[PDB]
Design an enzyme around this catalytic site. Structure first.
Site: not given
Ligand SMILES: O=C1CN(S(=O)(=O)c2cc3ccc(Cl)cc3s2)CCN1Cc1cc2cnccc2n1CCO
Ligand SMILES: [Ca+2]
Lengths: 53, 234
Positions: B42, B185-186, B88
Site C-alpha cells: 500500500h 507503514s512498510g 500487504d
Molecule cells: O485510521 C487509519 C490510520 N491510518 S495511519 O496511516 O495513521 C496508520 C496507523 C497505524 C497504527 C498501527 C500500525 Cl501497526 C500501522 C498504522 S498505519 C491507516 C488507515 N486508517 C483507516 C483504515 C484502516 C482500515 C483497515 N481496513 C479497511 C479500511 C481501513 N481504513 C479506512 C477507513 O477508515
C-alpha cells in the site's frame, strides 16, 4: 515439554523434529557449529545482529 | 511511533526509509539483503517516484552513514487489495548493492513453522520507524523503536471494525499510549531470539494510532516466506 518444545531443543536458531529427534539449522549467512546446535556467522555483518562498529 | 524510545547507535540497522522526489520519508522498509528491501504494497501508492535511504537515524543532520539507493524493480503481491489491506507485502530490488556498515545491516528471514511456534509465541516484538509520534502529530525526525506485545487473535478480531484476514496479525496495547502510526507503514516488525533479530511482520495498518481498544495490524510475514524467496530471485 519435549524436543524443540524443550528450550528450543538447545538450538541457537531453527529447530526441526525428525524421527523423534532434534535437528538444528541456521539462517542464510550462518553455518552450524561442530556441536550441531550453535550458529556461526559466515562473514561480516550477519543478519539479525545489531552493529557494534 | 507513539511512545517507545529512540533507536540508539547501531540498534535498528535493518530500517530502510522510502523517500519521495522531495526527499521526505513516507513509508518504512526492512533490509533483507544487499539487493532487497521488504515493504508494504500500500506504500507503492504514496509516490509516483521514490528511492530508498538506509543508515539514517536523525533526518535533521547527516551523520555520514546514510546512503540513498534507487529502485530497479518493484515486486508487488498480485493479490493486494486496497479495500481491506489484504496481502500487504512488496519486495524492492535496488539498482546498486547496499554496503553493510554501522547502522546498515539486514534482518534475518526465519523458517515458517519454527517462527510461528517459537518466535510469534514470545511476549513481545519490536516495531520501528520515522512515523508520527501522535495520531494528529507530525513525523519524527528521529528513528524510534517500541516493544509491542503480541495480541490474541480472537481478542483482536473482536476489537476491530474491519476484517482481519489470515495474512495479518495483531500487536500493541489495549489502552496504553504506545503503538505505530502513520509513516511507519512498510516498516519492520522483528522478534529477538537469543540476541538475533528475525523479520516477523510489516507495519500495515490500524484504526488511528494508540486508540483504546484498538491494536496495531501487521502483515503476517511467516505466511509469505515462499513468496519472498521467489521474489528475491527475479
Ligand atoms: O485510521 C487509519 C490510520 N491510518 S495511519 O496511516 O495513521 C496508520 C496507523 C497505524 C497504527 C498501527 C500500525 Cl501497526 C500501522 C498504522 S498505519 C491507516 C488507515 N486508517 C483507516 C483504515 C484502516 C482500515 C483497515 N481496513 C479497511 C479500511 C481501513 N481504513 C479506512 C477507513 O477508515
Ligand atoms: Ca541523518
Amino acid at each position: 515439554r519435549k524436543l524443540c518444545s524443550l528450550d528450543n531443543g538447545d538450538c541457537d536458531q531453527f529447530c526441526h523434529e525428525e524421527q523423534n529427534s532434534v535437528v538444528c539449522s541456521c539462517a542464510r549467512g550462518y553455518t552450524l557449529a561442530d556441536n550441531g546446535k550453535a550458529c556461526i556467522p559466515t562473514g561480516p555483518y550477519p543478519c539479525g545482529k545489531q552493529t557494534l562498529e | 511511533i507513539v511512545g517507545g524510545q529512540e533507536c540508539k547507535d547501531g540498534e535498528c540497522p535493518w530500517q530502510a526509509l522510502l523517500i519521495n522526489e522531495e526527499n521526505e520519508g513516507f513509508c518504512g522498509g526492512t533490509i533483507l539483503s544487499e539487493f532487497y528491501i521488504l515493504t508494504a504494497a500500500h506504500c507503492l501508492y504514496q509516490a509516483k517516484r521514490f528511492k530508498v535511504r538506509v543508515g539514517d537515524r536523525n533526518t535533521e543532520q547527516e551523520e555520514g552513514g546514510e546512503a540513498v539507493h534507487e529502485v530497479e524493480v518493484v515486486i508487488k503481491h498480485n493479490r493486494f487489495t486496497k479495500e481491506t489491506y489484504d496481502f500487504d507485502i512488496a519486495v524492492l530490488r535496488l539498482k546498486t548493492p547496499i554496503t553493510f556498515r554501522m547502522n546498515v545491516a539486514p534482518a534475518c528471514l526465519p523458517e515458517r513453522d519454527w517462527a510461528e511456534s517459537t518466535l510469534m509465541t514470545q511476549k513481545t516484538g519490536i516495531v520501528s520507524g520515522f512515523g508520527r509520534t501522535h495520531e494528529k502529530g507530525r513525523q519524527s525526525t528521529r528513528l524510534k523503536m517500541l516493544e509491542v506485545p503480541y495480541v490474541d487473535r480472537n481478542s483482536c478480531k473482536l476489537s476491530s471494525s474491519f476484517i482481519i484476514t489470515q495474512n495479518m496479525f495483531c500487536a500493541g496495547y489495549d489502552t496504553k499510549q504506545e503503538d505505530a502510526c502513520q509513516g511507519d507503514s512498510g516498516g519492520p516488525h522483528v522478534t529477538r531470539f537469543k540476541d538475533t533479530y528475525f523479520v516477523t511482520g510489516i507495519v500495515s495498518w490500524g484504526e488511528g494510532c494508540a486508540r483504546k481498544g484498538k491494536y496495531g495490524i501487521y502483515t503476517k510475514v511467516t505466511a509469505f516466506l515462499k513468496w519472498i524467496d521467489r521474489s528475491m530471485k527475479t
